[PDB]
Design an enzyme around this catalytic site. Structure first.
Site, PDB file in Angstrom:
ATOM      1  N   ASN A  58      -7.883 -48.582  19.753  1.00 11.02           N
ATOM      2  CA  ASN A  58      -6.682 -47.983  19.046  1.00 11.02           C
ATOM      3  C   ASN A  58      -6.271 -48.313  17.967  1.00 11.02           C
ATOM      4  OD1 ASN A  58      -5.812 -48.405  22.431  1.00 11.02           O
ATOM      5  ND2 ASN A  58      -5.832 -46.412  21.434  1.00 11.02           N
TER       6      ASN A  58
ATOM      7  N   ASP B 166      -1.138 -43.624  17.305  1.00 11.59           N
ATOM      8  CA  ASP B 166      -0.030 -43.369  18.247  1.00 11.59           C
ATOM      9  C   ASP B 166      -0.330 -42.442  19.374  1.00 11.59           C
ATOM     10  OD1 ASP B 166      -0.099 -40.847  17.110  1.00 11.59           O
ATOM     11  OD2 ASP B 166       2.284 -40.686  16.817  1.00 11.59           O
TER      12      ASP B 166
ATOM     13  N   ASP C 130      -2.809 -49.128  28.128  1.00  9.69           N
ATOM     14  CA  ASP C 130      -4.234 -49.706  28.085  1.00  9.69           C
ATOM     15  C   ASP C 130      -4.642 -49.760  26.494  1.00  9.69           C
ATOM     16  OD1 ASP C 130      -4.764 -47.004  27.648  1.00  9.69           O
ATOM     17  OD2 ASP C 130      -6.873 -47.386  28.348  1.00  9.69           O
TER      18      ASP C 130
ATOM     19  N   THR D  70      -8.883 -48.453  30.336  1.00 12.17           N
ATOM     20  CA  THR D  70      -9.886 -49.446  30.323  1.00 12.17           C
ATOM     21  C   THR D  70      -9.374 -50.658  30.806  1.00 12.17           C
ATOM     22  OG1 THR D  70     -10.627 -48.573  28.008  1.00 12.17           O
ATOM     23  CG2 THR D  70     -11.359 -51.076  28.740  1.00 12.17           C
TER      24      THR D  70
ATOM     25  N   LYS E 134      -5.877 -51.192  23.241  1.00  8.95           N
ATOM     26  CA  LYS E 134      -7.123 -51.708  22.865  1.00  8.95           C
ATOM     27  C   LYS E 134      -7.696 -51.735  21.735  1.00  8.95           C
ATOM     28  CE  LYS E 134      -9.205 -47.589  25.296  1.00  8.95           C
ATOM     29  NZ  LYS E 134      -7.954 -47.177  25.309  1.00  8.95           N
TER      30      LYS E 134
HETATM   31  C1  LIG Z   1     -10.907 -38.555  16.858  1.00 10.35           C
HETATM   32  C2  LIG Z   1     -11.893 -39.120  16.028  1.00 10.35           C
HETATM   33  O1  LIG Z   1     -11.865 -38.945  14.867  1.00 10.35           O
HETATM   34  C3  LIG Z   1     -12.736 -39.577  13.822  1.00 10.35           C
HETATM   35  O2  LIG Z   1     -12.346 -40.914  13.698  1.00 10.35           O
HETATM   36  C4  LIG Z   1     -10.642 -40.971  13.333  1.00 10.35           C
HETATM   37  C5  LIG Z   1      -9.734 -41.849  13.811  1.00 10.35           C
HETATM   38  C6  LIG Z   1     -10.206 -42.792  14.835  1.00 10.35           C
HETATM   39  C7  LIG Z   1      -9.057 -43.160  15.592  1.00 10.35           C
HETATM   40  C8  LIG Z   1      -9.693 -44.204  16.787  1.00 10.35           C
HETATM   41  C9  LIG Z   1     -10.826 -44.449  17.150  1.00 10.35           C
HETATM   42  O3  LIG Z   1     -11.101 -45.430  18.103  1.00 10.35           O
HETATM   43  C10 LIG Z   1     -11.747 -43.981  16.339  1.00 10.35           C
HETATM   44  O4  LIG Z   1     -13.220 -44.473  16.569  1.00 10.35           O
HETATM   45  C11 LIG Z   1     -11.607 -43.175  15.113  1.00 10.35           C
HETATM   46  O5  LIG Z   1      -8.883 -41.801  13.465  1.00 10.35           O
HETATM   47  C12 LIG Z   1      -8.191 -41.313  12.588  1.00 10.35           C
HETATM   48  C13 LIG Z   1      -6.799 -41.352  12.276  1.00 10.35           C
HETATM   49  C14 LIG Z   1      -6.341 -40.640  11.129  1.00 10.35           C
HETATM   50  O6  LIG Z   1      -5.054 -40.782  11.018  1.00 10.35           O
HETATM   51  C15 LIG Z   1      -7.064 -39.776  10.592  1.00 10.35           C
HETATM   52  C16 LIG Z   1      -8.495 -39.523  10.767  1.00 10.35           C
HETATM   53  O7  LIG Z   1      -9.167 -38.588   9.918  1.00 10.35           O
HETATM   54  C17 LIG Z   1      -9.040 -40.248  11.754  1.00 10.35           C
HETATM   55  C18 LIG Z   1     -10.175 -40.038  12.044  1.00 10.35           C
HETATM   56  O8  LIG Z   1     -11.161 -39.349  11.488  1.00 10.35           O
HETATM   57  C19 LIG Z   1     -14.137 -39.966  14.366  1.00 10.35           C
HETATM   58  O9  LIG Z   1     -14.885 -38.727  14.192  1.00 10.35           O
HETATM   59  C20 LIG Z   1     -14.062 -40.247  15.866  1.00 10.35           C
HETATM   60  O10 LIG Z   1     -15.558 -39.999  16.297  1.00 10.35           O
HETATM   61  C21 LIG Z   1     -13.434 -39.273  16.661  1.00 10.35           C
HETATM   62  O11 LIG Z   1     -13.215 -39.931  18.206  1.00 10.35           O
END
Ligand SMILES: C[C@@H]1O[C@@H](Oc2c(-c3ccc(O)c(O)c3)oc3cc(O)cc(O)c3c2=O)[C@H](O)[C@H](O)[C@H]1O
Ligand SMILES: [Mg+2]
Length: 286
Positions: free
Chosen positions: A143, A156, A138, A171, A140
């Site tokens: 991601n 990933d 899914d 979803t 989306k």
């Molecule tokens: C697991 C996510 O961590 C934080 O956002 C990051 C994300 C992320 C990914 C997909 C989402 O739809 C999204 O809203 C956020 O990704 C990251 C990727 C990285 O390689 C390093 C990071 O610090 C974050 C990173 O800090 C945010 O606090 C988010 O609320 C939480 O769900």
């Protein structure tokens, strides 16, 4: 209402714990919130710098995938995910100044020229994950991230917002027919989702959408798609080929896989080598 993280682990995976990391920095990263910069102490990636997120109320699901890994220009990886004292620790590629693709899509109107760029980077990323043995199911906009320069970074790992629990909770709007019916599927299911992403980027709307999950499901399985006539013949052709209900007939499903998409007239202007080298500039800078 609760975050579920899905970690697709490799065969030789080495489980981690809080003790295997040195804390370097604490950053405030906008959409990413509080991010710890940490250093891996042991193992094959000893000394590697990573971002760490500590989630208070999240669930973790770990799944198997279907050489030492190197970085791909259009992917961010979840390296470790472990739970300790009611908390979930995520160890991720550090992505300074990163942001959400959804933040961009809300602010801009994508033209076909814009979409060619984003979808071309996304195609390279998605094919790479397939080569690693990851099927998205899914895929989306949640991601899809953007780096500080505005290039695509596909996660990933799975991330969703989740009465009985399910091992897979996707979803529905982005799910191929063979995924909706749970009869078996392959990487070709992800090219359907790719088409859904393309459709949504171009129209601001989803191609199959009902009042409820049940209705949306029936539409995905049986609904004829109303192709927006403002789209170019090339865009129309690509979408029709991605939205083939029989996965065997779907673009990207044959032996050459993503090449079938790269060779499509919609992408005729893309230099894929230059793209991979990050030498093509994004339509929007964050
Ligand atoms: C697991 C996510 O961590 C934080 O956002 C990051 C994300 C992320 C990914 C997909 C989402 O739809 C999204 O809203 C956020 O990704 C990251 C990727 C990285 O390689 C390093 C990071 O610090 C974050 C990173 O800090 C945010 O606090 C988010 O609320 C939480 O769900
Ligand atoms: Mg781990």
């Amino acid at each position: 209402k609760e975050i579920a993280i899905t970690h697709h682990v490799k065969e030789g995976h080495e489980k981690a714990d809080p003790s295997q990391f040195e804390l370097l920095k604490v950053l405030g990263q906008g959409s990413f919130g509080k991010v710890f910069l940490v250093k891996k102490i042991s193992g094959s990636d000893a000394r590697q710098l990573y971002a760490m997120k500590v989630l208070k109320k999240a669930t973790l699901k770990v799944r198997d995938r279907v050489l030492v890994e190197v970085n791909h220009p259009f992917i961010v990886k979840l390296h470790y995910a472990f739970q300790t004292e009611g908390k979930l620790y995520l160890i991720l590629d550090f992505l300074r100044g990163g942001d959400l693709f959804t933040r961009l899509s809300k602010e801009v109107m994508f033209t076909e020229e814009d979409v060619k760029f984003y979808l071309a980077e996304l195609a390279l990323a998605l094919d790479h994950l397939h080569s690693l043995g990851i099927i998205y199911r899914d895929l989306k906009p949640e991601n899809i991230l953007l780096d500080e320069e505005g290039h695509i970074k596909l996660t990933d790992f799975g991330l969703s917002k989740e009465k009985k629990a399910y091992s897979f909770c996707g979803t529905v709007e982005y799910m191929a027919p063979e995924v909706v019916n749970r009869r078996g599927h392959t990487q070709s299911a992800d090219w359907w989702s790719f088409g859904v992403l393309m459709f949504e980027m171009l129209t601001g709307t989803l191609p199959f959408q009902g009042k409820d999950r049940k209705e949306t499901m029936t539409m995905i399985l049986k609904a004829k798609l109303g192709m927006p006539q403002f789209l170019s013949p090339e865009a129309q052709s690509l979408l029709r080929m991605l939205f083939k209900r029989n996965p065997a007939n779907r673009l990207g499903a044959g032996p050459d896989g993503v090449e079938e998409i790269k060779r499509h007239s919609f992408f005729s202007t893309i230099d894929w080598n230059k793209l991979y080298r990050r030498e093509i500039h994004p339509p929007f800078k964050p």
